[PDB]
Enzyme design. Structure first.
Site, PDB file in Angstrom:
ATOM      1  N   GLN A 158       0.814  -1.208   0.000  1.00 40.11           N
ATOM      2  CA  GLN A 158       0.000   0.000   0.000  1.00 40.11           C
ATOM      3  C   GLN A 158       0.850   1.261   0.000  1.00 40.11           C
ATOM      4  OE1 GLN A 158       0.111  -2.148   2.571  1.00 40.11           O
ATOM      5  NE2 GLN A 158       0.821  -0.976   4.350  1.00 40.11           N
ATOM      6  N   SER A 191       9.225   0.082  -1.038  1.00 38.96           N
ATOM      7  CA  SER A 191       9.744   0.785   0.124  1.00 38.96           C
ATOM      8  C   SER A 191      10.647  -0.152   0.911  1.00 38.96           C
ATOM      9  CB  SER A 191       8.609   1.307   1.015  1.00 38.96           C
ATOM     10  OG  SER A 191       7.952   0.246   1.683  1.00 38.96           O
ATOM     11  N   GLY A 213       6.195  -2.792   5.107  1.00 39.12           N
ATOM     12  CA  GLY A 213       5.353  -3.680   5.876  1.00 39.12           C
ATOM     13  C   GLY A 213       4.907  -4.834   5.008  1.00 39.12           C
ATOM     14  N   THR A 214       4.570  -4.547   3.747  1.00 37.34           N
ATOM     15  CA  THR A 214       4.364  -5.616   2.775  1.00 37.34           C
ATOM     16  C   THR A 214       5.180  -5.419   1.504  1.00 37.34           C
ATOM     17  OG1 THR A 214       2.449  -4.584   1.686  1.00 37.34           O
ATOM     18  CG2 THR A 214       2.022  -5.947   3.639  1.00 37.34           C
ATOM     19  N   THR A 259       9.530   4.984  11.846  1.00 38.51           N
ATOM     20  CA  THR A 259       8.155   4.574  12.091  1.00 38.51           C
ATOM     21  C   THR A 259       8.053   3.122  12.528  1.00 38.51           C
ATOM     22  OG1 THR A 259       7.761   3.923   9.791  1.00 38.51           O
ATOM     23  CG2 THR A 259       7.394   6.232  10.370  1.00 38.51           C
ATOM     24  N   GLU A 274      20.976   3.211 -21.758  1.00 39.11           N
ATOM     25  CA  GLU A 274      22.089   4.147 -21.646  1.00 39.11           C
ATOM     26  C   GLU A 274      22.271   4.603 -20.206  1.00 39.11           C
ATOM     27  OE1 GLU A 274      19.834   3.893 -23.751  1.00 39.11           O
ATOM     28  OE2 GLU A 274      20.817   3.711 -25.700  1.00 39.11           O
ATOM     29  N   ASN A 334       3.247  12.821  -3.510  1.00 38.99           N
ATOM     30  CA  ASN A 334       3.128  11.888  -4.624  1.00 38.99           C
ATOM     31  C   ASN A 334       3.249  12.614  -5.957  1.00 38.99           C
ATOM     32  OD1 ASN A 334       2.584  10.240  -2.451  1.00 38.99           O
ATOM     33  ND2 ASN A 334       0.381  10.119  -2.862  1.00 38.99           N
ATOM     34  N   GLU A 375      -3.361  -6.143   1.731  1.00 40.71           N
ATOM     35  CA  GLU A 375      -4.488  -5.777   2.576  1.00 40.71           C
ATOM     36  C   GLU A 375      -5.569  -5.130   1.727  1.00 40.71           C
ATOM     37  OE1 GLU A 375      -1.330  -5.201   2.964  1.00 40.71           O
ATOM     38  OE2 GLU A 375      -0.718  -5.090   5.066  1.00 40.71           O
ATOM     39  N   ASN A 391      11.733  11.345   2.510  1.00 40.71           N
ATOM     40  CA  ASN A 391      10.596  12.257   2.595  1.00 40.71           C
ATOM     41  C   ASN A 391      10.882  13.486   3.449  1.00 40.71           C
ATOM     42  OD1 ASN A 391      10.747  10.247   4.642  1.00 40.71           O
ATOM     43  ND2 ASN A 391       8.716  10.856   5.380  1.00 40.71           N
TER      44      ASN A 391
HETATM   45  N1  LIG Z   1       5.546   4.805  -0.232  1.00 37.64           N
HETATM   46  C1  LIG Z   1       4.762   5.444   0.621  1.00 37.64           C
HETATM   47  N2  LIG Z   1       5.077   5.427   1.956  1.00 37.64           N
HETATM   48  C2  LIG Z   1       4.282   6.074   2.817  1.00 37.64           C
HETATM   49  C3  LIG Z   1       3.155   6.758   2.390  1.00 37.64           C
HETATM   50  N3  LIG Z   1       2.617   7.272   3.522  1.00 37.64           N
HETATM   51  C4  LIG Z   1       3.364   6.939   4.613  1.00 37.64           C
HETATM   52  N4  LIG Z   1       4.407   6.183   4.163  1.00 37.64           N
HETATM   53  C5  LIG Z   1       5.527   5.533   4.859  1.00 37.64           C
HETATM   54  O1  LIG Z   1       5.776   4.327   4.155  1.00 37.64           O
HETATM   55  C6  LIG Z   1       5.788   3.207   5.023  1.00 37.64           C
HETATM   56  C7  LIG Z   1       4.936   2.089   4.429  1.00 37.64           C
HETATM   57  O2  LIG Z   1       5.598   0.857   4.625  1.00 37.64           O
HETATM   58  P1  LIG Z   1       4.840  -0.472   5.142  1.00 37.64           P
HETATM   59  O3  LIG Z   1       4.075  -0.177   6.409  1.00 37.64           O
HETATM   60  O4  LIG Z   1       5.830  -1.581   5.390  1.00 37.64           O
HETATM   61  O5  LIG Z   1       3.816  -0.858   3.958  1.00 37.64           O
HETATM   62  P2  LIG Z   1       3.475  -2.363   3.477  1.00 37.64           P
HETATM   63  O6  LIG Z   1       4.666  -3.294   3.416  1.00 37.64           O
HETATM   64  O7  LIG Z   1       2.830  -2.287   2.118  1.00 37.64           O
HETATM   65  O8  LIG Z   1       2.432  -2.978   4.546  1.00 37.64           O
HETATM   66  P3  LIG Z   1       1.622  -2.157   5.675  1.00 37.64           P
HETATM   67  O9  LIG Z   1       2.215  -2.413   7.046  1.00 37.64           O
HETATM   68  O10 LIG Z   1       0.205  -2.666   5.715  1.00 37.64           O
HETATM   69  O11 LIG Z   1       1.601  -0.684   5.344  1.00 37.64           O
HETATM   70  C8  LIG Z   1       5.290   3.651   6.387  1.00 37.64           C
HETATM   71  O12 LIG Z   1       6.269   3.316   7.349  1.00 37.64           O
HETATM   72  C9  LIG Z   1       5.130   5.152   6.273  1.00 37.64           C
HETATM   73  O13 LIG Z   1       5.980   5.762   7.211  1.00 37.64           O
HETATM   74  C10 LIG Z   1       2.817   6.780   1.025  1.00 37.64           C
HETATM   75  O14 LIG Z   1       1.837   7.349   0.525  1.00 37.64           O
HETATM   76  N5  LIG Z   1       3.647   6.110   0.156  1.00 37.64           N
END
Ligand SMILES: Nc1nc2c(ncn2[C@@H]2O[C@H](COP(=O)(O)OP(=O)(O)OP(=O)(O)O)[C@@H](O)[C@H]2O)c(=O)[nH]1
Ligand SMILES: Nc1nc2c(ncn2[C@@H]2O[C@H](COP(=O)(O)OP(=O)(O)OP(=O)(O)O)[C@@H](O)[C@H]2O)c(=O)[nH]1
EC number: 3.6.5.-
Lengths: 438, 78, 98, 49, 270, 427
Positions: free
Chosen positions: A11, A140, A144-145, A179, A254, A228, A71, A206
């Site tokens: 997400q 990322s 988290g996922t 975080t 390139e 974004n 999710e 960020n």
């Molecule tokens: N890339 C991105 N990161 C964000 C955004 N908003 C907040 N974040 C940061 O990006 C991180 C998201 O990483 P994860 O929590 O591991 O996401 P995930 O692996 O898809 O799984 P979740 O735990 O459900 O979110 C968070 O720690 C936030 O601090 C956004 O819009 N885009």
């Protein structure tokens, strides 16, 4: 022909994936329905969209991207959005279970029964494609996922498809903001797994993105809509060569050849020079000289590194808009005459120029300026090893007192793989130091 | 007037014509002939309709040099 | 929600193209190619062959025969020929028309 | 299609751009100099009268 | 850091350079030589609104000026980009050659546009085969030979619809079918035959006058094919986009011709 | 009769050939469509040296375009003269270049050389008897250098009895954009030296100086730079197509410039370059061109031969001149700088006079130079080569393609041999 496939894991990568595609539909004038006005651009799916969208005989632009998530909250809600009819339903790869910030859960527990489904998409995306230069991976490190699930698939797509490019884009972990305290665990785990397969990993932070917001854009309270948009602008600039032409046309192939000096290390830095408010654009002027100083001003970078504490190897400037070589070549010559900018003696020339005529347009309800002359500055410098040096001295503390290990060993993992990453990391800094030593 | 109107006066002010003359009282048919004398050709229907509106905007009802020219530009823009 | 708030679409935002065309115009200068390197006065036809002039055309008719006598700077026979003929159909033999 | 599209607009714009600025400025100057001068003198001279 | 009125020495020199050219390009075009002057004059001639013939008996007569239209039909199975509305045939000149010469390409392309307004581009004068001693104003008869001519806004020269057996060199650009063109030459390839709408009643209706504003099928005498328009095949031309027009016979399941070759003869409205 | 077929290579040559061919077409009075407007007989006579005849008075160019990226020749085809070029002559590949020298020389070249050789031999059979060939490309131009080195090699054994004219541009000394460019140049030049017979050396930086010096328009277009070199390239070709007592053959010329086989690299020189006042403030006389013709500022190719000396000089004069003014000039110039030539060869000047002026100007000329000023060029590339080869930077790609540093060993050694050769001949 000249096309690619975009990938958006977690997400964290979905709403940036939305924003980029939202931005993309503007300059092509894509109506949310999926069709143009009575004007004719539809056919066998071939126009400026053919490299991005699949607007076949059905007449509907089909983005060549995959949104994978674990999710259902955000993915089903965006499925109730505005462009959802454009998006392919099962292309919007949803999930029912989370990885709990754990790399292994997304890499072992559930990724097995999901990657087969998405691979069916990729091959069925591959067959219709013609050239498919590579892929656009958005993720990322603190995933988290995003972290665990991407790592397995990039292994799977590398082994079956090892003859094409794979472009990686992820938010770099905030050096001083955490975080998650499990975030260092998966982040270095991802790096050691990806160093031997990832082609070009591009990172960003960020905190400095916010720092720009209230410095020149003068926004003390922005949102993801702005954040974004900025990165969506960044990927738009690098993909303008795919969309439009220029004085000289450049491609990711390139980019790979001319940016990465040596294997393993493939982690340059990106920066956009004309970041200014609309009014600050209104009563001043933009030209190659001052923006070159701006993009080479140390505080304009989105990653917390002092270039004077490091040294420069590769630099790529992608001038999108109305520019002439005469002032550009003179301006960069003045830059080469500058003493503060310390390139390594190994490279006399380190500048890769990509000229694109197209002015970067504004977005409706946006916060950017009215830019006629823009440049994307992709550079690689030695001032980044401090980030991993920052990572390890956090990691070594926690590892000795082995916090949260019961979580990871409880789900079936062990200490060796954690042990591996550090000398993999320790190899990185020493290589960074050795290449730093001339 | 202010020094700006003293240091940069309009062409009127160099040779002694001013605002009280603009706002002063004169009669209907006389200025119509003068308007022709100053080189603008007009129709009778335009004269009265202009006269009606000018009295309204003045909030009192009269003929002033500013009023006559201003409504001309209003019609010219219209 | 702000998520839907920024999804609010709006018409009349027409992605134009004119900036393409000006920028393209700047990178070639289409008519300038015959304008960069043109010299002295424009002239549609000026060419003629030396053999045709001296042998066939019998040289310049409108010229004055004794245009050669005591001059100025070089106070002697001069103003005869530095101009040379340029006029008359140069490329008009019968094989072209056939 | 792009080639034929390319031609006219490049020729077209240069035409209107050249001619429009050629006329616009040409007239815009003249009547202003005319109207301001001619009106003032004829109105102000009789104001003296 | 410059540009408006700096009158700097290089700016001095530069501003001249283009300016004599601006004079030079002026006098060249002041001679009525501008391309868009050519285009507007040609468009002016082509887009000239015409006055159609009005049939008083309800039938058609030689020399009449009519518009040939494929009517809108409610077909719910043509999946794809189908064009609604009544489609009237119109000559389609080449864009590039129209810029180079004021004279129309000696042969000319054909097209159908969603336009019913009378105009030089869609007005057709019905004419006899020449071999038949048919007088002007004589009623036209089913099964008879005749010609479809258009005066494409040109004084003294007359364009006739043409078609020939498809070769590898002469074919439709999109579908690769038998193309339809317009030539000034008078040939047996200019012979056309209107057929009654019902194939089961053609022999009964042979030798009969043709009514005004009704469904008919036209056939080339030399090739015996019906005039076809493709409401799904888009062609790009000088005025925009229109629909491909060829000569082919499309029959339905019952060997009955489709909506495609059903054409409207449109007479003037009194 | 004797004709020439052109090859359009590299992505620069794509803009080179497009400008170069239109320079020929408008000079010969053919409309963009192709229907020649018959006004000049000698060009109507001598069009068969380059152009063949299609139906309806259309002069088909005898040139072949080759590339890999569709957008380039699509832009070239969408140019004002794309209709005069042939889709038959549009051969290309289905791959992005990566702008890698080896890929275009070993990987991508393998499956395209077959078709292009078929195209040229079909074109070779189309015409009767060729003087030779000329090629537009860049030595530092990655895809062009890869294809050219392959093609020049193959056409050698194909026709070892013709003219292998080469036209390549030297990248900017101050910055090469491409960082592996010195590798590409060193790779290419190692093949260039033995396979070529003629080479034109052109640099962009000097062109920019000419922009600042006489053009004075601040911002040109690269096409204007294309126009300059095409005008110079046209001038040397004016000898063949045009009459006048000038011996036109390059072989006439080549033996006149080439004392020893290793001398393949030659520098151009052009005639009146004119600024704003000087289109109407110039008393156009044969003298006043010459000092401008022999202007170090007018020199545009590589650098100033002031640092070195002059081996061979040959200038072709286009317009209504006579044998004496060039003669007394030739006397004047050798008097001015007698010691700056070599005592090795006296009377090292070769003059030709074309009686047919160009369209727009009357008295013009072109110059080709072989002086001792190329040392700066390959000496510069030498330290660049030693710098990266010191720690083999950016080398893993070529090994991945299948190349090794052990190939680089003789390429510089061959180049080092050329360093002494130019030095030993002069110093
Ligand atoms: N890339 C991105 N990161 C964000 C955004 N908003 C907040 N974040 C940061 O990006 C991180 C998201 O990483 P994860 O929590 O591991 O996401 P995930 O692996 O898809 O799984 P979740 O735990 O459900 O979110 C968070 O720690 C936030 O601090 C956004 O819009 N885009
Ligand atoms: N066409 C073109 N080429 C340019 C221009 N400016 C510099 N060049 C150089 O001209 C060279 C020759 O082009 P090519 O031989 O086709 O190069 P390539 O094999 O396609 O690959 P690269 O040399 O890496 O670009 C290029 O390498 C450019 O560096 C320009 O404005 N237009």
């Amino acid at each position: 022909m000249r096309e690619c496939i975009s990938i958006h894991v977690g997400q964290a990568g979905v709403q940036i994936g939305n924003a980029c595609w939202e931005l993309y539909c503007l300059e092509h004038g894509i109506q949310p329905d999926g069709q143009m006005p009575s004007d004719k651009t539809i056919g066998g799916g071939d126009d400026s969209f053919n490299t991005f969208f699949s607007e076949t005989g059905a007449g509907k632009h089909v983005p060549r991207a995959v949104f994978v998530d674990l999710e259902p909250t955000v993915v089903d809600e965006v499925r109730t959005g505005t462009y959802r009819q454009l998006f392919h339903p099962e292309q919007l790869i949803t999930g029912k279970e989370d990885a709990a910030n754990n790399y292994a859960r997304g890499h072992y527990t559930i990724g097995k029964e999901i990657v087969d489904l998405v691979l069916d998409r990729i091959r069925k995306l591959a067959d219709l494609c013609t050239g498919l230069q590579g892929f656009l991976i958005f993720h990322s490190f603190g995933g988290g996922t995003g972290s665990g699930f991407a790592s397995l698939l990039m292994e799977r797509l590398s082994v079956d498809y090892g003859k094409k490019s794979k472009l990686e884009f992820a938010i770099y972990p905030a050096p001083q903001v955490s975080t998650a305290v499990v975030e260092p665990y998966n982040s270095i785990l991802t790096t050691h797994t990806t160093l031997e397969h990832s082609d070009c990993a591009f990172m960003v932070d960020n905190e400095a993105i916010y720092d720009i917001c209230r410095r020149n854009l003068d926004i003390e309270r922005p949102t993801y809509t702005n954040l974004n948009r900025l990165i969506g602008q960044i990927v738009s600039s690098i993909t303008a060569s795919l969309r439009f032409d220029g004085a000289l046309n450049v491609d990711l192939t390139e980019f790979q050849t001319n940016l990465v000096p040596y294997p393993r290390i493939h982690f340059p830095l990106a920066t956009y020079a004309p970041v200014i408010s609309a009014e600050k654009a209104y009563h001043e002027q933009l030209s190659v000289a001052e923006i070159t100083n701006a993009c080479f001003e140390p505080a304009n970078q989105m990653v917390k590194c002092d270039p004077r504490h490091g040294k420069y190897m590769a630099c790529c400037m992608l001038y999108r808009g109305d520019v002439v070589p005469k002032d550009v070549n003179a301006a960069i010559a003045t830059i080469k005459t500058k003493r503060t900018i310390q390139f390594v003696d190994w490279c006399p020339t380190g500048f890769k120029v990509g000229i694109n005529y197209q002015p970067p347009t504004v977005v409706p309800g946006g916060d950017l300026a009215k830019v006629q002359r823009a440049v994307c500055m992709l550079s690689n410098t030695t001032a980044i090893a401090e980030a991993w040096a920052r990572l390890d001295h956090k990691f070594d503390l926690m590892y000795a007192k082995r916090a949260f290990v019961h979580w990871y060993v409880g789900e079936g993992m062990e200490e060796g793989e954690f042990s591996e990453a550090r000398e993999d990391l320790a190899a990185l800094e020493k290589d960074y130091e050795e290449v730093g030593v001339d | 007037g202010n020094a700006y109107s003293l240091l940069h006066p309009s062409i009127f002010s160099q040779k002694g014509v001013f605002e009280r003359d603009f706002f002063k009282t004169r009669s209907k048919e006389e200025i119509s002939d003068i308007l022709t004398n100053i080189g603008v050709k007009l129709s009778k229907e335009e004269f009265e309709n202009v006269w009606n509106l000018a009295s309204k905007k003045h909030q009192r009802g009269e003929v002033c040099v500013e009023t006559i020219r201003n409504v001309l530009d209003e019609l010219l823009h219209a | 929600c702000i998520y839907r708030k920024e999804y609010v679409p709006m018409p009349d935002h027409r992605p134009d193209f004119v900036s393409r065309w000006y920028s393209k115009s700047k990178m070639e200068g289409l008519p300038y190619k015959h304008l960069i390197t043109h010299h002295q006065e424009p002239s549609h036809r000026y060419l003629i062959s030396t053999y045709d002039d001296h042998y066939n055309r019998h040289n310049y008719n409108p010229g004055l025969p004794a245009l050669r006598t005591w001059n100025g700077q070089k106070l002697l026979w001069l103003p005869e020929k530095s101009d040379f003929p340029l006029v008359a159909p140069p490329t008009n033999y019968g094989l072209l028309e056939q | 299609v792009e080639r034929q599209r390319f031609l006219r607009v490049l020729q077209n714009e240069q035409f209107e751009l050249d001619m429009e600025e050629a006329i616009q400025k040409a007239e815009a100057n003249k009547m202003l100099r005319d109207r301001q001068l001619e009106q003032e003198e004829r109105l102000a001279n009789e104001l003296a009268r | 850091v410059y540009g408006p009125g700096v009158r700097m020495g290089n700016w001095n020199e530069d501003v001249y350079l283009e300016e004599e050219r601006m004079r030079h390009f002026l006098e060249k075009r002041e001679k009525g030589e501008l391309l868009i002057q050519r285009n507007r004059r040609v468009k002016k001639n082509i887009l000239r609104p015409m006055q159609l013939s009005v049939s008083e008996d309800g039938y058609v007569h030689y020399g009449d000026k009519v518009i040939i239209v494929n009517p809108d039909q409610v077909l719910g199975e043509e999946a794809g980009k189908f064009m609604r509305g009544d489609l009237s045939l119109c000559m389609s000149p080449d864009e590039v050659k129209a810029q180079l010469s004021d004279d129309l390409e000696i042969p000319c392309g054909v097209s159908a546009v969603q336009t019913i307004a009378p105009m030089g581009r869609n007005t057709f004068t019905i004419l006899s085969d020449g071999a038949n001693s048919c007088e002007m104003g004589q009623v036209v008869v089913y099964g008879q030979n005749f010609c479809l001519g258009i005066a494409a806004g040109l004084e003294g020269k007359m364009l006739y619809l043409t078609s020939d057996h498809r070769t590898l060199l002469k074919s439709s650009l999109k579908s690769g079918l038998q193309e339809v063109t317009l030539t000034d030459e008078v040939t047996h390839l200019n012979c056309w035959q209107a057929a009654f709408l019902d194939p089961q009643l053609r022999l009964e209706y042979e030798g009969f006058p043709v009514r005004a504003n009704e469904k008919i099928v036209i056939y080339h005498r030399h090739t015996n094919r019906a005039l076809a328009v493709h409401r799904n095949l888009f062609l790009r031309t000088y005025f925009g986009k229109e629909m491909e027009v060829v000569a082919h016979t499309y029959l339905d399941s019952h060997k009955v011709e489709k909506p495609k070759n059903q054409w409207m003869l449109v007479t003037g409205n009194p | 009769m004797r004709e020439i077929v052109h090859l359009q290579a590299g992505q620069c040559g794509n803009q080179i050939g497009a400008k170069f061919w239109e320079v020929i077409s408008d000079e010969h009075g053919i409309d963009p469509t192709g229907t020649y407007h018959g006004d000049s007989d000698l060009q109507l006579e001598r069009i068969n040296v380059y152009y063949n005849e299609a139906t309806g008075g259309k002069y088909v160019p005898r040139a072949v375009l080759v590339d890999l990226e569709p957008g380039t020749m699509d832009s070239v085809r969408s140019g004002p003269f794309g209709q005069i070029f042939r889709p038959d002559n549009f051969v290309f590949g289905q791959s992005g270049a990566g702008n890698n020298w080896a890929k275009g020389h070993y990987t991508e070249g393998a499956e395209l050389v077959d078709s292009v050789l078929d195209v040229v031999r079909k074109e070779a059979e189309s015409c009767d008897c060729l003087q030779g060939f000329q090629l537009t490309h860049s030595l530092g131009g990655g895809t062009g250098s890869g294809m050219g080195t392959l093609l020049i090699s193959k056409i050698r054994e194909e026709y070892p009895d013709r003219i292998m004219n080469t036209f390549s541009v030297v990248p900017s000394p101050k910055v090469s954009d491409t960082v592996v460019e010195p590798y590409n140049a060193t790779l290419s030049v190692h093949q260039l030296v033995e396979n070529t017979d003629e080479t034109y050396c052109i640099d962009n930086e000097a062109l920019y100086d000419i922009c600042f010096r006489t053009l004075k328009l601040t911002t040109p277009t690269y096409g204007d730079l294309n126009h300059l070199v095409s005008a110079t390239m046209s001038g040397v070709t004016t000898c063949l197509r045009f009459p006048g007592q000038l011996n036109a053959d390059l072989r006439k010329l080549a033996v006149n410039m080439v004392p020893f086989p290793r001398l393949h690299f030659f520098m151009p020189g052009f005639a009146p370059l004119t600024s704003r006042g000087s289109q109407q403030y110039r008393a156009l006389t044969v003298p006043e061109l010459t000092q401008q013709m022999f202007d170090a500022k007018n020199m545009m190719a590589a650098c100033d031969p002031r640092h070195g000396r002059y081996l061979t000089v040959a200038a072709v004069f286009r317009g209504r001149m006579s044998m004496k003014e060039v003669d007394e000039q030739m006397l004047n110039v050798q008097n001015k700088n007698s010691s700056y030539f070599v005592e090795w060869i006296p009377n090292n000047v070769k003059t030709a006079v074309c009686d047919i002026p160009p369209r727009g100007l009357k008295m013009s000329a072109t110059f080709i130079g072989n002086s001792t000023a190329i040392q700066e060029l390959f000496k510069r590339i030498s330290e660049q080569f030693t710098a990266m080869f010191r720690r083999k930077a950016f080398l893993h790609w070529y090994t991945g393609e299948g190349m090794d540093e052990m190939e680089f060993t003789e390429a510089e050694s061959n180049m080092n041999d050329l360093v002494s050769e130019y030095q030993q001949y002069q110093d």
